[PDB]
Nucleic acid binder design. Sequence first.
DNA 1: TGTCCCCCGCGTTTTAACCGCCAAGGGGATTACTCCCTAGTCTCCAGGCACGTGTCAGATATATACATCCTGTGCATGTATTGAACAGCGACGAT
Length: 46
Amino acid sequence: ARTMQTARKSTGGKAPHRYRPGTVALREIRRYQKSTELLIRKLPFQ
DNA sequence: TGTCCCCCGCGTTTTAACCGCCAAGGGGATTACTCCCTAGTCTCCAGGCACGTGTCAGATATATACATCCTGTGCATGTATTGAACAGCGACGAT
């Protein structure tokens, strides 16, 4: 085999999930623009 | 384009909003009654407006002084360049 190669040795063969900032904000925009429920609390306002 | 930081998102902790139910009296709604106040009417006239007029406060034209806005000189200083005056090394002749 290559153990007998004395010159010109043949070397061929051997060796949680986070959302991006701004996404939840936009989703909140979509959520409250569809609804009409009051946003400010009732008792602190009173 | 480049930096630094100011919110965004998310888990955990803290608070009071919200609902359900009862208890109570403050005040608004409603009625009945009376009279004081305002619409309506008439007569009377001066307060308010049109019209006319007279003139001075203000617009216009023209001359001058004040302000300012910007560019072009100067200055000054640093730097670059160049000339000159120190410095070889060696061959020669005079001593």
